[PDB]
Amino acid sequence: GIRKYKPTTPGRRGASVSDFAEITRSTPEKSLVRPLHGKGGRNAHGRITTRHKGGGHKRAYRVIDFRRHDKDGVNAKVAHIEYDPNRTANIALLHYLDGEKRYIIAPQGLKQGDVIESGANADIKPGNNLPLRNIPAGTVIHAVELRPGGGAKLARSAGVSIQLLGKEGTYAALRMPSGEIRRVDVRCRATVGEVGNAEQSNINWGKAGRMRWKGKRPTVRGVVMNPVDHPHGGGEGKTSGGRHPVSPWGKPEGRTRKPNKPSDKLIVRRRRTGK
Template sequence: MALKKYNPTTPGRRQMTGYTFEELTTSKPFKALTHSLWRNHAWRNNTGRITTRHQWGGHKKSYRIIDFHYVDKLDIPAKIETIEYDPYRTSYIALVCYRDWERRYVTAHKDMKVWDEMITSKNAKLISWNRLEIWNIPVGLSIYNVEIIVWKGASSVRSAGSSATILSQEWEYTQVKMPSGEIRLVHKLCYATLGVVSNTDHNQVVIGKAGRSRWKWIRPTVLGKSMNPVDHPHGGWEWHSPIGMPYPKTPWGKPALGVKTRKRKDTNKWVLRKRDWRLMKK
């Protein structure tokens, strides 16, 4: 994938970059697999108060129904019909047509082309974008759309340009190195797709101007110290003063920045190393 740089006709355009969309083959989605999530409530409730901060407005968009399970199409080959843009995710998506003539959207591989074939099978060939049980994947290969819980569908490694790596196959579990650096145990009956997610240059895009963020439904974020005391614990005093307390707080008075918020400890047994490479305490 390549990025395009705009001519500096305005200050906002001077550093702005964007997608060339050269991989895409169509600009219109398959209507039967879309529905609208648009609600013109601007993230306010019935009394007009903001219920979700930092979101408002934005361009209207349709949600594409993506298949993250695949398992009800075991051993049924499919052909790639189109590579498309999805406004609700950073990666591209592919419209596939199975041999039984059912069409579904799936996450696109970075090298996927129209008329390529894919299949979901327990012992599928080791070809990019094929999906198979994780114990059949050799050590060192890259994977994405990883299942963490058996038969629950792909829940990890789905964003643009991401991939996990198989580190070892031991007993009932496979050691997988996640994109964050965390090493996690995944049950061998879980499925994963071979390869790397599409749109690998997504993190290189320069937004360029504030208005482009507003198109994405993103409102500005303001420091608490710039607010009034009634709006934030850090607020008040003159100009851009220090927060005036020993540790930072959230707008609701809870400790912030560096405070551990993970409450679900029963899943710690599946994590061998944290993303900072420290061993997980059991």
């Protein structure tokens, strides 16, 4: 849910916050938390490679298991659903009947105490993990692997879900979140269901400081810069750059996907813009 603040202050007027309804515990598992220090967008050389990053609130990493291959046929129960800072969707903590505790992304509709069985013979209720070969065509899945055994890579955000369009040969044709249709090997695992926090996109932060908490930093437009700093710079008065729009390093706007890529043969069709 979404809770909207009352206009007690100008910084708070239009603001709203995530109604933490699905959260059950306020403390992570001690053994599954590992340290994580912010970099500020600066690589190993020391320079700033991605701009507008820094500040932010100190946070620690919760070990999320995208490699659900070890436990096949060992059921688990969703012990809790808690809040993860790093990622957009919640995370559920699984208590394996074996005795091992693991963290996974919380799929939509998941509730505490539910059973989650992963394996080739698992059912098709949300939360279960089974390789794409055993998933019936047309269902809705998430956290799909890319290679047969490389970890979950596609459709991991909140409210985002992949629809397995069909199977053919040793390739499953998926409809990615972006609307593009891509084939993937049918040996790779996927998790059934959508993903939680479908109401993340409706959050209205409401003030400049709130995004400074989240780790962003102010972004300076181009037409204000000087001609050295940005190609749009200069001009007496207000200008629109006097040129076709470019990135701060001169490269013009246009498609940047590298042509002739090995993974190009898999892509059935690319996403459509403006239609």
